[PDB]
Amino acid sequence: STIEEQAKTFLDKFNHEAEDLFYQSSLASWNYNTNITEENVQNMNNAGDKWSAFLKEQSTLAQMYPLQEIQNLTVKLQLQALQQNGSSVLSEDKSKRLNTILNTMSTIYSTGKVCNPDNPQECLLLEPGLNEIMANSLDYNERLWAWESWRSEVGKQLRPLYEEYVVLKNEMARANHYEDYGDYWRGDYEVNGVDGYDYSRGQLIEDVEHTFEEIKPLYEHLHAYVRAKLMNAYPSYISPIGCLPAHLLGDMWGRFWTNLYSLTVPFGQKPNIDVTDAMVDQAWDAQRIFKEAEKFFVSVGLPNMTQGFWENSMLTDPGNVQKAVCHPTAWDLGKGDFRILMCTKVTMDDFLTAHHEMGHIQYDMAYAAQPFLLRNGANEGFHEAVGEIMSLSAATPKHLKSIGLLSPDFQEDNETEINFLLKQALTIVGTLPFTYMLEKWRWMVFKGEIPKDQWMKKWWEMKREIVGVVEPVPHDETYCDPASLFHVSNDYSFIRYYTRTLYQFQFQEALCQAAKHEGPLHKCDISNSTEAGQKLFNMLRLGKSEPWTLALENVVGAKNMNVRPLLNYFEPLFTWLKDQNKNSFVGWSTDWSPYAD
Amino acid sequence: NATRFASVYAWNRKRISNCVADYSVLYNLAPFFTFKCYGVSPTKLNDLCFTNVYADSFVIRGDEVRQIAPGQTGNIADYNYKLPDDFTGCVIAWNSNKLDSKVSGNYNYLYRLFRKSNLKPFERDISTEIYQAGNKPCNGVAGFNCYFPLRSYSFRPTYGVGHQPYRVVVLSFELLHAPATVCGPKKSTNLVKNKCVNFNFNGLKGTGVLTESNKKFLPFQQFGRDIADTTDAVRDPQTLEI
Structure with a gap:
């Protein structure tokens, strides 16, 4: 009856079937990714609609009396993830139409069919097809087709379909x-209730702008190095003063720069670090590649795994009769369990994702006894930022010697680590301004200050002053260049990849200051140190019971988002790109266009 | 080793009284998943025993076995059940992936996570009370800052280490001022005859030579005495022989 005694009793009949109605859509989506049959898709639909109605049945009966009578800090930080009503505040003709437009937006992205209009008699499949022809085709007219036509037949009707989708999204x-x-x-970044550590939603607009100013010397030297090495490849297509064309970045849009590594090799006489040729001699199988990767989790100070991980999850594709989709996603299925589905091969990129997808297991292991609203990341990008600390530490040559992988007498000079660090520069730094200009494009079309004719004209004007690319053909107001990706068509957050590269670097810069490592941070390995886990164990168990401002105090100690771990990780990359850029053009300019002939 | 169990708020009282406990097939064989407890070691339970033993049957997650501790606070330890500071029992867990689980969700037994107040140790609360946290009443339904408690399980044997069905049988021991009734197994040795040896029987202790008796006896007796009040007879605790 007293007002101060009543803290929190919501987690009885909410937090026990928040997992359980998602559980019946968990394995039904997991059997959809292993056993694609005619009846293993129907159990995803009727059980997923029960969990989709569970978040709207309790939202209509939570409309009585307001919030301001609470005193405890543990009550408010879980209350923000449940009081969002979602789509249930609109009418009957407006709310249910959002459910139908999201099912027709993901179908044409996965089952698209676009090919050559000159010879359309042989027309190929998109997703295994066009992902791998971008790397080997050294022709100007061949790479012009895979970028322009994909947004010309798939993205032609999304432009009269995205304009009323933004309008209904403002009302909810x-x-x-x-x-x-x-x-x-x-809204996940909103911190309230603690004095001195208040992080509002209006503070995040200047914070991404504050960390973008010091990356402009680092990105424009990588913008001038790929351009200077494409003179012998493309002599009369790319200007040395202007920007690079956007249809040759290696992928479908230019988020990752991973396929431009073999053409921009600095020194071709020395071999790259390679595990693929030394794997087939010792005859490894699927049981070895997770057991010694779990040896990396014991040696820091995290406890062992029992028999439930080895007999439930499989690593081999179950025959050639049944199709199994094997995208790398660590399955966070509710209150602390992980079944791993990965089509493993003898591949270095498969080896680093074994430490990446198991790095999202070790974050959710420590708060497995915590509630489900606190069983999340500190933000949306906090889950994958603490997962790739095990992949950058396993790409270190000092870790490969202790196990028995590579040759025991391998030469390590100053010209060895530079080809490894420019491989990481097109994985970490190469996606960093590309994450900025799409999230700023999302923050300029939702407020509605711009007209309909400046909806796509503002997109190609930002790319010539932020990332430094220019389109080879111009687009009218009937096409869409940013809306043909995986995250935007299925309505996923794109802010989570800008904080992936920031929170990962803050943790690894201080992890071997506890483990006492002398040298650069790309030789830092967190293994053989039992005191290195104790700095992480108070951080791995804080989840959303403590916010992200107090979560950074025990490792790095910075309450704000800083750029200073991103600078001294690449300290040979800042010095050795300077002497080779004495005669080229630093930066980019807004005058060169390929269609301005 | 039952085929059914109960809720963690609907704990049955398996009253173990006037029994003989056999831990040579349960503790020494150990077919359970984990065998770890505090307060009293399980090797001391064969040589020490108590007045009244109480047991239960409940299946929880693998994350809630850290909550079952004397003096514990947190998620389960103050709102579903509470272990007191004088807890002299032991907590044994076993994975029950093949027996206690159910396909298409386990929707039969319920459990809680929070409560109105801190419950007493061994409290059987099966209430369906209406909560009111703020200043306006709720009239039986939930609300903004008004909540309700009572939801069931999510068990399935295809996942990892977090929330598999772990059958936890808390064997609570209690020593009272009453004498003991339920005690554990104690090993036996062989019997030698016609030699001057020592005696360590169930109710006898001495030193003498065992010969064949030619007298009559009562089977509810422990020993016998001669005309000079000395112990000259012993009954075997296993066989009906003097």
Whole structure:
């Protein structure tokens, strides 16, 4: 009856079937990714609609009396993830139409069919087809087809389909006491209730701008190095003063720069570090590649795994009769369990993702006894930022010697680590301004300050001053260049990849200051140190019971988002790109266009 | 080793009284998943025994076995059950992936995570009370800052180490001022005859020579005495022989 005694009793009949109605869509989506039959897709639908109605049945009966009577800090930090009503504040003709437009947006992205209009008699499949023809085709007219036509037959009707989708998306968040849908992705970043550590949603707009100013000397030297090495490849297509064309970045849009590594090799006389030729001699199988990778988890100070991980999850593809989709996703299925489905091969990129997908297991292992609202990341990008600390530490040549992998007498000079660090520069730094200009494009079209004719004209004007690319053909107001990706078509957050590269670097810069490593941070390995886990164990168990401002105090000690771990990780990369750029053009300019002939 | 069990708020009281405990097939064989407890070691339970033993049957997650501790606070230890500071029992868990689970969700037994207040140790609360956290009443339904408690399980044997069905049987021991009734197994040795040896029987202790008796006896007796009040007879605790 007293007002101060009543803290929190929501987690009885909410937090026990928040997992369980998702559980019946968990394995039904997992059997959809292993056993694609005619009846293993129907159990995803009727059980996933029960969990989709569970978040709206309790939201209609939670509309009585307001929030301001609470005193405890543990009550408020879980309350923000349940009081979002979602789509249930609109009418009957407006709310259910959002469910139908999201099912027709993911179908044409996966089952698209676009090919050559000159000779359309042989027309190929998109997703295994066009992903691997970008790397080997050294022709200007061949790479022009795979970028232009894909947004010309798939993205031609999304432009009259995305304009009324943004308009209905403003109504579901303006009724949820927010200013827009633009801070709905920043709603997880909202910190309230602690004095001195208040992080509002309006503070995040200047914070991404503050960390982008010091990356402009680092990115424009990588912008001038790929361009200077494409003179012998493309002599009369790319200008040395202007920007690079966007249809030759190696992928479908230019988020990852991974296929431009073999053409921009600095020194071709020395071999790259390679595990693929030394794997087939010792005859490894699927049981070895997770057991010695779990030896990396014991040696820091995290406890062992029991028999439930080895007999439930399989690593081999179950025959050639049944199709199994094997995208690398660590399955966070509810209150702390992980079944791993990965089509493993003898591949270095498969070996680093074995430490990546198991790095999302070790974050959710420590708060497995915590509630499900606290069983999440500190933000959306906090889950994958603490997962790739095991992959950058396993690509270290000092770790490969202790196990028995590579040759025991391998030469390590100053010209060895530079080809490894420019491989990491097109994986970490190469996606960093590409994450910026799409999230700023999302924050400029949701508020509605711009007209309909400047919807796509603002997209190609940002890419010639942020990332330094220019389109070879111009687009009218009927096409869409950013809306043909995986995260935007299936309505996923794109802010989670900008904080993936920032929170990962803050943890690894201080992890071997506890383990007492002398040298650069790309030779830092966190193995054979039992005191290196104790700095992480108070951070791996804080989840959302403590916010992300107090989560960074025990490792790095910075309450704000800083750029200083990103600078001294690449300290040979800042010095050795300077002497080779004495005569080229630093940066980019807004005058060169390929269609301005 | 039952085929059914109960809820963690609907704990049955398996009253183990006037029994003989056999731990040579349960503790020494150990077919359970983990065998770890505090307070009293399980090797001291064969040589020490108590007045009244109480047991239960409940299946929980593998994450809630850290909550079952004397003096524990947290998620389960103050709102579903509470172990007291004088807890002299032991907590044994076993994975029950093939028996206690159910396909298409386990929707039969329920459990809680929070409560109105801190419960007493060994409290059987089966209430379906209405909660009110703020200043306006709820009239039986949930609300903004008004919640309700009572939801069931999520068990399935295809996943990892977090929330598999772990059958936890807490064998609570209690020593009272009453004498003991339930005690554990104690090993036996062979019997030698016609030699001056020592005696360590069930109710006898001495030193003498065992010969064949030619007298009559009562089977509810422990020993016998001669005309000079000395112990000259012993009954075997296993066989009906003097």
